[PDB]
Coordinates of C-alpha atoms and ligand atoms in Angstrom, one line a residue:
Chain A
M1 CA -45.4 59.6 -32.3
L2 CA -49.2 60.0 -31.9
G3 CA -49.7 56.9 -29.8
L4 CA -53.2 56.5 -31.1
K5 CA -54.5 53.2 -29.8
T6 CA -57.7 52.7 -32.1
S7 CA -58.3 49.2 -33.9
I8 CA -59.0 50.5 -37.4
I9 CA -59.6 54.1 -38.0
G10 CA -56.4 56.1 -37.2
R11 CA -54.2 53.1 -38.0
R12 CA -52.4 55.6 -40.2
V13 CA -52.9 59.3 -40.6
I14 CA -51.6 61.4 -43.5
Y15 CA -51.2 65.1 -42.3
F16 CA -51.2 67.9 -44.8
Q17 CA -50.5 71.6 -43.9
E18 CA -52.8 72.3 -46.6
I19 CA -54.7 70.4 -49.2
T20 CA -57.3 70.8 -52.2
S21 CA -59.7 68.4 -50.4
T22 CA -59.2 65.5 -48.2
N23 CA -62.1 63.5 -49.6
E24 CA -60.7 64.1 -53.1
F25 CA -57.2 62.9 -51.8
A26 CA -58.7 59.7 -50.0
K27 CA -60.8 58.8 -53.1
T28 CA -57.9 59.3 -55.5
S29 CA -55.1 57.8 -53.7
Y30 CA -54.4 54.3 -52.9
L31 CA -54.8 54.1 -49.1
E32 CA -55.5 51.4 -46.6
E33 CA -58.7 51.0 -44.6
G34 CA -58.6 53.1 -41.6
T35 CA -56.2 55.8 -42.9
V36 CA -57.0 59.2 -41.8
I37 CA -56.4 62.3 -44.0
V38 CA -56.3 65.7 -42.2
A39 CA -55.3 69.0 -43.2
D40 CA -54.6 72.4 -41.5
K41 CA -56.8 74.1 -44.3
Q42 CA -58.3 73.1 -47.7
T43 CA -58.3 75.3 -50.5
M44 CA -61.2 73.5 -52.4
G45 CA -63.4 72.1 -49.5
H46 CA -66.6 70.6 -50.7
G47 CA -69.9 69.7 -49.5
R48 CA -72.9 68.1 -51.2
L49 CA -74.0 68.7 -54.7
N50 CA -71.1 70.6 -55.8
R51 CA -71.4 73.0 -52.9
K52 CA -68.3 74.4 -51.6
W53 CA -67.0 74.2 -48.0
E54 CA -65.1 76.8 -46.1
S55 CA -62.0 75.2 -44.5
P56 CA -59.8 77.8 -42.9
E57 CA -56.9 77.0 -40.4
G58 CA -58.5 76.5 -36.8
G59 CA -61.1 73.9 -37.7
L60 CA -61.0 69.9 -38.0
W61 CA -60.9 68.9 -41.7
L62 CA -60.6 65.0 -42.0
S63 CA -61.5 62.2 -44.2
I64 CA -61.2 58.5 -43.4
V65 CA -61.0 55.6 -45.7
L66 CA -63.3 52.7 -45.0
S67 CA -64.1 49.3 -46.5
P68 CA -67.3 48.4 -44.6
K69 CA -67.8 44.6 -44.6
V70 CA -71.5 44.7 -44.4
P71 CA -74.3 44.4 -46.9
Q72 CA -75.1 47.4 -49.6
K73 CA -78.2 48.3 -47.7
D74 CA -76.4 49.5 -44.7
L75 CA -74.1 52.0 -46.6
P76 CA -76.2 55.0 -46.2
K77 CA -75.8 54.7 -42.4
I78 CA -72.2 55.7 -42.6
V79 CA -73.0 59.2 -42.9
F80 CA -74.6 58.9 -39.3
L81 CA -71.6 57.3 -38.3
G82 CA -69.7 60.5 -38.7
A83 CA -72.6 62.6 -37.4
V84 CA -72.9 60.7 -33.9
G85 CA -69.0 60.7 -33.7
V86 CA -69.0 64.4 -33.8
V87 CA -72.1 64.8 -31.3
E88 CA -70.1 62.6 -29.0
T89 CA -67.0 64.3 -29.2
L90 CA -69.1 67.7 -28.6
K91 CA -70.8 66.1 -25.6
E92 CA -67.1 65.5 -24.3
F93 CA -66.4 69.2 -24.6
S94 CA -69.9 69.9 -23.1
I95 CA -71.3 71.1 -26.2
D96 CA -75.0 70.5 -27.1
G97 CA -74.6 69.3 -30.8
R98 CA -77.6 68.0 -32.4
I99 CA -78.1 66.0 -35.7
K100 CA -80.0 67.5 -38.6
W101 CA -81.0 65.0 -41.1
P102 CA -79.2 64.3 -43.5
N103 CA -75.5 65.1 -42.8
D104 CA -75.5 67.9 -40.1
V105 CA -74.7 68.9 -36.5
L106 CA -75.9 71.9 -35.1
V107 CA -75.6 73.9 -32.0
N108 CA -78.6 76.1 -31.2
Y109 CA -79.6 75.5 -35.0
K110 CA -76.4 76.9 -36.2
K111 CA -74.2 74.6 -38.1
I112 CA -70.9 73.4 -36.4
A113 CA -70.1 70.5 -38.6
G114 CA -70.8 68.7 -41.9
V115 CA -70.4 65.1 -42.8
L116 CA -69.9 63.9 -46.4
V117 CA -69.7 60.2 -47.5
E118 CA -68.6 59.5 -51.1
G119 CA -67.6 56.7 -53.3
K120 CA -68.5 53.2 -53.3
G121 CA -67.1 49.8 -54.1
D122 CA -64.8 48.5 -51.5
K123 CA -63.5 52.0 -50.6
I124 CA -65.8 54.4 -48.7
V125 CA -64.6 57.9 -47.8
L126 CA -66.0 59.4 -44.5
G127 CA -65.4 63.0 -44.5
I128 CA -65.9 65.4 -41.8
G129 CA -65.7 69.1 -41.1
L130 CA -65.8 70.5 -37.6
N131 CA -65.4 74.3 -36.9
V132 CA -63.2 74.4 -33.8
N133 CA -61.0 77.5 -33.5
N134 CA -61.7 78.9 -37.1
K135 CA -63.8 81.7 -38.3
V136 CA -67.0 80.6 -39.6
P137 CA -69.4 81.5 -42.2
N138 CA -72.6 83.8 -40.9
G139 CA -75.1 81.8 -39.3
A140 CA -72.8 78.9 -38.4
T141 CA -71.0 78.4 -35.0
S142 CA -68.0 76.6 -33.7
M143 CA -66.6 74.9 -30.5
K144 CA -64.8 78.2 -29.7
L145 CA -67.6 80.3 -30.4
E146 CA -69.5 78.0 -28.2
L147 CA -67.4 77.6 -25.2
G148 CA -66.1 81.3 -25.3
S149 CA -62.4 80.1 -25.3
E150 CA -60.1 78.4 -27.8
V151 CA -60.1 74.4 -27.8
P152 CA -57.0 72.4 -28.1
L153 CA -57.5 71.0 -31.8
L154 CA -55.5 68.0 -31.4
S155 CA -57.7 67.0 -28.4
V156 CA -60.9 67.1 -30.5
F157 CA -58.8 65.0 -33.2
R158 CA -58.1 62.4 -30.6
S159 CA -61.7 62.3 -29.2
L160 CA -63.5 62.0 -32.8
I161 CA -61.1 59.3 -34.0
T162 CA -61.6 57.4 -30.6
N163 CA -65.4 57.5 -31.1
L164 CA -65.5 56.8 -34.5
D165 CA -63.2 53.9 -34.1
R166 CA -65.7 52.3 -31.5
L167 CA -68.8 53.4 -33.7
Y168 CA -67.4 51.8 -36.8
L169 CA -66.4 48.4 -35.0
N170 CA -69.7 48.1 -33.5
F171 CA -71.3 49.1 -37.1
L172 CA -69.3 46.2 -38.6
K173 CA -70.9 44.0 -35.9
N174 CA -74.4 45.4 -35.5
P175 CA -75.1 47.8 -38.4
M176 CA -78.7 48.6 -37.0
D177 CA -77.1 49.9 -33.6
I178 CA -76.3 53.1 -35.1
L179 CA -79.8 54.3 -35.8
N180 CA -80.8 54.2 -32.2
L181 CA -78.1 56.9 -31.4
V182 CA -79.0 58.8 -34.2
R183 CA -82.8 58.9 -33.1
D184 CA -81.7 60.1 -29.5
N185 CA -79.5 62.6 -31.0
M186 CA -81.5 64.0 -34.0
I187 CA -83.6 67.2 -34.1
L188 CA -87.2 65.7 -34.4
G189 CA -90.7 66.7 -33.7
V190 CA -90.5 70.1 -35.6
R191 CA -91.8 71.3 -39.0
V192 CA -89.4 70.9 -41.6
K193 CA -89.3 71.6 -45.4
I194 CA -88.0 69.2 -48.0
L195 CA -86.4 70.3 -51.3
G196 CA -86.1 67.7 -54.2
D197 CA -88.3 67.3 -57.1
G198 CA -90.4 70.2 -56.1
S199 CA -91.1 70.1 -52.2
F200 CA -93.5 69.6 -49.3
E201 CA -93.5 70.4 -45.7
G202 CA -94.6 68.6 -42.6
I203 CA -93.1 67.2 -39.1
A204 CA -89.8 65.2 -39.2
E205 CA -91.0 62.6 -36.6
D206 CA -88.4 60.0 -36.8
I207 CA -86.0 57.9 -39.0
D208 CA -87.0 54.4 -40.0
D209 CA -85.2 51.2 -40.1
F210 CA -83.2 52.3 -43.2
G211 CA -82.3 55.8 -41.7
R212 CA -84.9 57.3 -43.9
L213 CA -86.6 60.5 -42.5
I214 CA -90.2 60.1 -42.0
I215 CA -92.3 63.3 -42.5
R216 CA -96.2 63.6 -41.5
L217 CA -97.8 66.0 -43.8
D218 CA -100.8 68.2 -42.6
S219 CA -102.8 66.2 -44.6
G220 CA -101.9 63.2 -42.5
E221 CA -99.9 61.8 -45.2
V222 CA -96.7 60.0 -44.5
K223 CA -93.6 60.4 -46.6
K224 CA -90.3 58.7 -46.4
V225 CA -87.3 60.9 -47.3
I226 CA -84.2 59.1 -48.8
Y227 CA -81.1 61.0 -48.8
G228 CA -79.8 61.9 -52.3
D229 CA -80.2 65.1 -54.3
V230 CA -82.5 66.5 -51.5
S231 CA -82.2 69.4 -49.0
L232 CA -83.8 69.8 -45.7
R233 CA -84.7 73.2 -44.1
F234 CA -86.3 74.0 -40.6
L235 CA -89.3 76.4 -40.4
Chain B
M1 CA -54.7 69.5 -37.3
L2 CA -51.1 69.6 -36.2
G3 CA -50.7 73.3 -37.3
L4 CA -46.9 72.9 -38.2
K5 CA -45.3 75.8 -39.8
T6 CA -42.4 74.6 -41.4
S7 CA -41.2 75.6 -45.0
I8 CA -40.3 72.1 -46.4
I9 CA -39.9 69.5 -43.7
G10 CA -43.1 68.8 -42.2
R11 CA -45.3 70.0 -45.3
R12 CA -46.8 66.6 -44.8
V13 CA -46.4 63.9 -42.3
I14 CA -47.7 60.2 -42.6
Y15 CA -47.9 58.8 -39.1
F16 CA -48.2 54.8 -38.4
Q17 CA -49.3 53.1 -35.1
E18 CA -46.9 50.3 -36.4
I19 CA -44.5 49.7 -39.2
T20 CA -41.4 47.7 -40.2
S21 CA -39.1 50.6 -40.6
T22 CA -40.0 54.3 -41.6
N23 CA -36.6 54.5 -43.6
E24 CA -37.5 51.4 -45.9
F25 CA -41.1 52.9 -46.4
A26 CA -39.9 56.2 -47.4
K27 CA -37.4 54.5 -49.8
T28 CA -40.1 52.5 -51.6
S29 CA -42.9 54.7 -51.9
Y30 CA -43.0 58.1 -54.1
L31 CA -43.2 61.0 -51.6
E32 CA -42.5 64.8 -51.9
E33 CA -39.8 66.4 -50.3
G34 CA -40.3 67.5 -46.7
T35 CA -42.5 64.3 -46.0
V36 CA -42.2 63.1 -42.6
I37 CA -42.8 59.2 -41.9
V38 CA -43.1 58.6 -38.4
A39 CA -44.4 55.7 -36.1
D40 CA -45.0 54.9 -32.7
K41 CA -43.4 51.6 -33.2
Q42 CA -41.0 49.9 -35.8
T43 CA -41.0 46.2 -36.0
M44 CA -37.9 46.2 -38.0
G45 CA -35.9 49.0 -36.6
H46 CA -32.8 49.7 -38.8
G47 CA -29.3 50.8 -37.7
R48 CA -26.1 50.9 -40.1
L49 CA -25.1 47.9 -42.1
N50 CA -27.1 44.9 -40.5
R51 CA -27.5 46.3 -37.0
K52 CA -31.0 46.4 -35.5
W53 CA -32.4 49.6 -34.0
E54 CA -34.7 48.8 -30.9
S55 CA -38.1 50.9 -31.5
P56 CA -40.5 50.4 -28.6
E57 CA -43.4 52.6 -28.0
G58 CA -42.6 55.8 -26.2
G59 CA -39.7 57.0 -28.6
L60 CA -39.4 59.0 -31.6
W61 CA -38.4 57.1 -35.0
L62 CA -38.9 59.1 -38.1
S63 CA -37.3 59.5 -41.8
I64 CA -37.5 62.5 -43.8
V65 CA -37.7 62.8 -47.6
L66 CA -35.2 65.2 -49.2
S67 CA -33.9 65.9 -52.6
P68 CA -31.3 69.0 -51.9
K69 CA -29.8 69.5 -55.4
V70 CA -26.6 71.0 -54.2
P71 CA -23.1 69.7 -55.2
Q72 CA -22.7 65.8 -54.9
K73 CA -19.7 66.3 -52.4
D74 CA -22.0 67.9 -49.8
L75 CA -24.7 65.0 -49.9
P76 CA -22.6 63.3 -47.1
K77 CA -23.4 65.9 -44.6
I78 CA -27.0 65.2 -44.4
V79 CA -26.4 62.9 -41.5
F80 CA -25.0 65.9 -39.6
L81 CA -28.1 67.7 -40.3
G82 CA -29.9 65.3 -38.3
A83 CA -27.4 65.1 -35.7
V84 CA -27.2 68.7 -35.0
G85 CA -31.0 68.9 -35.1
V86 CA -31.2 66.2 -32.4
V87 CA -28.5 68.2 -30.4
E88 CA -30.6 71.4 -30.8
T89 CA -33.9 70.3 -29.5
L90 CA -32.4 68.4 -26.7
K91 CA -30.9 71.5 -25.5
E92 CA -34.2 73.0 -25.6
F93 CA -35.2 70.3 -23.0
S94 CA -32.1 71.4 -21.2
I95 CA -30.2 68.0 -22.0
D96 CA -26.6 68.5 -23.5
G97 CA -26.3 65.8 -26.3
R98 CA -22.9 65.3 -27.7
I99 CA -22.3 64.2 -31.4
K100 CA -20.1 60.7 -31.6
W101 CA -18.7 60.5 -35.1
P102 CA -20.4 59.6 -37.5
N103 CA -24.0 59.2 -36.8
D104 CA -24.4 59.3 -32.9
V105 CA -25.5 61.7 -30.2
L106 CA -24.4 60.8 -26.7
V107 CA -25.7 62.3 -23.5
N108 CA -22.6 61.7 -20.9
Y109 CA -21.4 59.0 -23.2
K110 CA -24.7 57.3 -23.4
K111 CA -26.3 56.8 -26.7
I112 CA -29.7 58.5 -26.7
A113 CA -30.3 59.2 -30.5
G114 CA -28.9 57.8 -33.9
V115 CA -29.0 59.0 -37.4
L116 CA -29.2 57.1 -40.5
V117 CA -29.3 58.7 -44.0
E118 CA -29.8 56.4 -47.2
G119 CA -29.7 57.7 -50.7
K120 CA -32.3 56.0 -53.0
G121 CA -32.4 57.6 -56.6
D122 CA -32.0 61.0 -56.3
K123 CA -34.0 61.0 -53.4
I124 CA -32.5 61.2 -49.8
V125 CA -33.9 59.6 -46.7
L126 CA -32.7 61.0 -43.3
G127 CA -33.6 58.4 -40.7
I128 CA -33.7 59.7 -37.1
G129 CA -34.0 57.5 -34.0
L130 CA -34.5 59.3 -30.5
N131 CA -35.2 57.6 -27.3
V132 CA -37.5 59.7 -25.3
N133 CA -40.0 57.9 -22.8
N134 CA -39.3 54.2 -24.4
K135 CA -37.6 51.3 -22.7
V136 CA -33.8 51.7 -23.8
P137 CA -31.0 49.0 -24.3
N138 CA -28.4 48.7 -21.5
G139 CA -25.8 51.4 -21.6
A140 CA -28.1 53.7 -23.6
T141 CA -30.1 56.6 -22.1
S142 CA -33.4 58.6 -22.9
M143 CA -34.7 62.2 -22.4
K144 CA -37.1 60.5 -19.8
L145 CA -34.1 59.1 -18.0
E146 CA -32.0 62.5 -18.1
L147 CA -35.0 64.6 -16.9
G148 CA -36.7 62.0 -14.5
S149 CA -39.9 62.6 -16.0
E150 CA -42.0 61.7 -19.0
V151 CA -41.7 64.1 -21.9
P152 CA -44.6 65.1 -24.5
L153 CA -43.6 62.9 -27.5
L154 CA -45.3 65.4 -29.9
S155 CA -43.5 68.3 -28.2
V156 CA -40.3 66.7 -29.1
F157 CA -41.7 66.3 -32.6
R158 CA -42.5 69.7 -33.3
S159 CA -39.2 71.0 -31.8
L160 CA -37.1 68.8 -34.1
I161 CA -38.9 69.3 -37.1
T162 CA -38.7 73.0 -36.7
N163 CA -35.1 72.7 -36.2
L164 CA -34.4 70.4 -39.2
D165 CA -36.5 72.6 -41.5
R166 CA -34.2 75.4 -40.4
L167 CA -31.2 73.5 -40.8
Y168 CA -32.1 72.3 -44.2
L169 CA -33.3 75.6 -45.6
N170 CA -29.8 77.1 -44.9
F171 CA -28.0 73.9 -46.0
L172 CA -29.3 74.5 -49.4
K173 CA -27.8 77.9 -49.6
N174 CA -24.7 77.4 -47.4
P175 CA -23.8 73.8 -47.5
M176 CA -20.7 74.4 -45.5
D177 CA -22.2 75.9 -42.2
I178 CA -23.4 72.7 -41.0
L179 CA -19.6 71.3 -40.4
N180 CA -19.0 74.3 -37.9
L181 CA -21.9 73.4 -35.9
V182 CA -20.9 69.6 -36.0
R183 CA -17.3 70.6 -34.8
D184 CA -18.6 72.9 -31.7
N185 CA -20.8 69.8 -30.6
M186 CA -18.7 66.8 -31.5
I187 CA -16.9 64.7 -29.2
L188 CA -13.2 65.0 -30.1
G189 CA -9.8 65.7 -28.6
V190 CA -10.0 62.0 -27.4
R191 CA -8.8 58.6 -27.8
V192 CA -10.7 56.2 -30.3
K193 CA -10.0 53.3 -32.0
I194 CA -11.4 52.5 -35.7
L195 CA -12.3 48.8 -36.3
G196 CA -12.1 46.5 -39.3
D197 CA -9.6 45.0 -41.5
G198 CA -6.8 47.7 -40.8
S199 CA -8.0 48.7 -37.6
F200 CA -5.9 51.3 -35.8
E201 CA -6.0 53.9 -32.8
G202 CA -5.4 57.4 -32.3
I203 CA -6.7 60.8 -31.3
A204 CA -9.7 62.1 -33.1
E205 CA -8.6 65.4 -33.9
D206 CA -11.3 66.9 -36.0
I207 CA -13.8 66.5 -38.8
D208 CA -12.9 67.0 -42.4
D209 CA -14.1 69.6 -44.7
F210 CA -15.8 66.4 -46.2
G211 CA -17.0 65.5 -43.0
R212 CA -14.2 62.8 -42.5
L213 CA -12.8 62.1 -39.2
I214 CA -9.1 63.1 -38.8
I215 CA -7.2 60.6 -36.7
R216 CA -3.7 61.4 -35.4
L217 CA -1.8 57.9 -34.9
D218 CA 0.6 57.4 -32.2
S219 CA 3.2 57.6 -35.0
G220 CA 2.3 61.0 -36.0
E221 CA 0.4 59.6 -39.0
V222 CA -2.9 61.1 -39.8
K223 CA -5.6 59.1 -41.4
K224 CA -8.9 60.6 -42.6
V225 CA -11.7 58.2 -42.0
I226 CA -14.7 58.0 -44.1
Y227 CA -18.1 56.4 -42.9
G228 CA -18.7 53.1 -44.3
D229 CA -18.3 49.8 -42.5
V230 CA -16.0 51.4 -40.0
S231 CA -16.8 51.1 -36.4
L232 CA -15.9 53.9 -33.9
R233 CA -15.1 53.0 -30.5
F234 CA -13.8 54.9 -27.4
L235 CA -10.9 53.8 -25.4
Ligands
BT5_301 N1 -67.1 76.0 -42.3 C1 -68.4 75.9 -42.4 N2 -69.0 75.7 -41.1 C2 -70.6 75.7 -41.4 N3 -71.2 75.6 -42.4 C3 -70.5 75.7 -43.5 C4 -69.1 75.9 -43.8 N4 -68.9 75.9 -44.9 C5 -69.7 76.1 -45.8 N5 -70.9 75.7 -45.0 C6 -72.3 75.8 -45.5 O1 -72.8 74.2 -45.5 C7 -73.0 73.6 -46.8 C8 -72.5 72.7 -47.1 O2 -73.4 71.7 -46.7 P1 -73.5 70.5 -47.1 O3 -74.6 69.8 -46.1 O4 -73.7 70.0 -48.4 O5 -72.1 69.6 -46.6 C9 -71.4 69.6 -45.6 O6 -72.1 69.7 -44.6 C10 -70.2 68.6 -45.7 C11 -69.2 69.1 -45.5 C12 -68.2 68.2 -45.4 C13 -66.7 68.9 -45.1 C14 -65.5 67.8 -45.1 S1 -64.0 68.9 -44.7 C15 -63.0 67.1 -44.7 C16 -63.6 66.6 -46.2 N6 -62.8 67.3 -47.4 C17 -63.8 68.0 -48.0 O7 -63.6 68.7 -49.1 N7 -65.0 67.9 -47.5 C18 -65.1 67.1 -46.4 C19 -72.6 74.9 -47.8 O8 -73.4 75.1 -49.0 C20 -72.7 76.2 -46.8 O9 -73.6 77.0 -47.0
BT5_302 N1 -33.1 52.4 -28.9 C1 -31.8 52.5 -29.1 N2 -31.0 53.5 -28.3 C2 -29.5 53.3 -28.2 N3 -28.9 52.6 -28.9 C3 -29.7 51.6 -29.6 C4 -31.0 51.6 -29.7 N4 -31.3 50.5 -30.6 C5 -30.3 49.9 -30.8 N5 -29.2 50.6 -30.3 C6 -27.6 50.2 -30.6 O1 -27.2 51.0 -31.8 C7 -26.8 50.4 -32.8 C8 -27.3 50.8 -33.9 O2 -26.1 51.9 -34.3 P1 -26.0 52.5 -35.7 O3 -24.9 53.3 -35.4 O4 -25.6 51.6 -36.8 O5 -27.5 53.2 -36.0 C9 -27.8 54.2 -35.8 O6 -27.2 54.8 -34.7 C10 -29.2 54.6 -36.5 C11 -30.3 54.5 -36.0 C12 -31.5 55.1 -37.0 C13 -32.7 54.9 -36.4 C14 -34.0 55.4 -37.2 S1 -35.5 55.0 -36.4 C15 -36.2 56.0 -37.8 C16 -35.4 55.3 -39.2 N6 -36.2 53.8 -39.5 C17 -35.3 53.0 -39.3 O7 -35.5 51.5 -39.5 N7 -34.1 53.5 -38.9 C18 -34.2 54.9 -38.7 C19 -27.0 49.0 -32.5 O8 -26.2 47.9 -33.1 C20 -27.4 48.8 -31.2 O9 -26.4 48.3 -30.4
MN303 MN1 -76.1 69.4 -45.1
MN304 MN1 -23.2 54.7 -34.6

């Protein structure tokens, strides 16, 4: 009845009035490639490193089951597929979303969406959380808060699935293509601070051919940040 | 992201771009009560017995999982809940549908929808087929044809599912109410013929407290017809 016309992502969709977490459901359940798990609200929304994600009604909370037939070295680029997908859909709604390494999309430096990729094997779960018409935590923003008016959620859904379908199909073909789109749409050239084992500061200049963030320290030293147990902050 | 506000029916919806039969899928896979199985297109549409149900794009093909734990005798009224439901949403779109015993709803005697309930284990699958914008078989009709314009498929979906939910919740408490609604919306007082070995004709008088069709043959003899492999024809 939805009439989706995408090739893989969205071949099926399981909608929930509410769920604990779409990622948890997708990881746990036996689902086929391309199945999309979406829910009005999550009671146990999750972010990275055991962080929790507010998921009240009005936002877009979905997860996509994937089985990327590409080399294991490319898997980390999947988080970017999500990130660019959102950016593209925000641009469709004339919202200037910008990517923040490693998994965030901001509007005027205020987070409007999160992206979390979990699992491995032959089943990757692409989790996405965009604020649309829902209330959001302090410091964050939403499509509705950006346009000054409510946005038809189902329209945002169709737009995102459509972009992700195209992005994903091309990624299976050319796994490198995504990083060009990531560069063009990521927040670079500004001072950033990296928290992992200890921490350091410098300018985030670009992402290399592995999606790793390249930081140039004041000492002229250049570090390559790989996403894992790490956090990025703007100065 | 659908924002459905149903109590039971529509708590979860599993959409497919394509499927064999939503009824069969709903029968073979464990699903929770209220789960709705819907597809843009069915490849193996199913009618009663071994009849096929055309299910091209543009129509509404869905099945709902139920386990109403009320007396066994009432179980057969499920089909009517589906038909009355279709009749209700049709009126919402200004179309007057009429229930043809036992599982059909006609619009000026042209079949616009059909209902098919299958009882698997102690789980009951209510199957519904409604023609909306799709191509229909010769002799049949669709909402698009009655209105002369395309109808937003999702709008009809929301409408039917809120209606069924309401009808169902009351069924669980007052399983006897549904019959009245059927009598008020069924095609009776007319001449019909019931086919099969033992075929006969008569006036379709009323519907039993069991949902049986009461027929008055020209002899004055009254037969109570149960829906099995009997075929109802209008003369
Ligand atoms: N609704 C919201 N909008 C903006 N920021 C939020 C937010 N809710 C929480 N936050 C903040 O963002 C941080 C989380 O950031 P992270 O970078 O680690 O994590 C993320 O940004 C990923 C979020 C992924 C959410 C989706 S919803 C569909 C799927 N099902 C799930 O359970 N999860 C995924 C938190 O620690 C908060 O400070
Ligand atoms: N699209 C259509 N519109 C009107 N009539 C149709 C039609 N497709 C087929 N027919 C005719 O209607 C007859 C079928 O009548 P019956 O009374 O037996 O059967 C019905 O009227 C029940 C149809 C139930 C359809 C739904 S779709 C969702 C679910 N998944 C399934 O696989 N099935 C259910 C056929 O013999 C055809 O002649
Ligand atoms: Mn983040
Ligand atoms: Mn029939």
